[PDB]
Nucleic acid binder design. Structure first.
Ligand SMILES: [Zn+2]
Length: 118
DNA sequence: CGGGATATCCCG
DNA sequence: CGGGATATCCCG
């Protein structure tokens, strides 16, 4: 349990184009402002709220296919391009930098997330 | 032999 | 409009 805070880094129309590099993409600032100070019971809820926010933000929603926006409307993470999957983890994941500190959270591809941790 | 993740199941 | 309980991913 905890409240989200942070809010940072502006985003463009190639938001997740590089999710597979380095630390990935950051929490869009537009999204962070929508989630800041909100109350979440588990990180899973946050993740569920986060993806819903991405589906209601027009500038971001258009960077995804019809299928992916449907996923995000109900809180599921959008699928990554096939080249970025890792076994059965096939959707963008949220990485933490070592829990609702949105400036410490970033979006990365399964494949890239694996390497970062090892 | 533990740590970091997403997703579904289902609410009398 | 939620979220607890539970399943299952993938790492050496
Ligand atoms: Zn991570």
């Amino acid at each position: 349990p905890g409240k989200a805070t942070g809010k940072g880094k502006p985003v463009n129309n190639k938001w997740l184009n590089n999710a597979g590099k380095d630390l990935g993409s950051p929490v869009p600032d537009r999204i962070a402002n929508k989630l800041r100070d909100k109350e979440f019971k588990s990180f899973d809820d946050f993740r569920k709220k986060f993806w819903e926010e991405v589906s209601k933000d027009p500038e971001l929603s258009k960077q995804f296919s019809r299928n992916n926006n449907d996923r995000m409307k109900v809180g599921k993470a959008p699928k990554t391009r096939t080249q970025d999957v890792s076994g059965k983890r096939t959707s963008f994941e949220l990485h933490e930098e070592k829990v609702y500190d949105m400036d410490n959270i970033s979006v990365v591809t399964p494949k890239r997330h694996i390497d970062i941790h090892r």
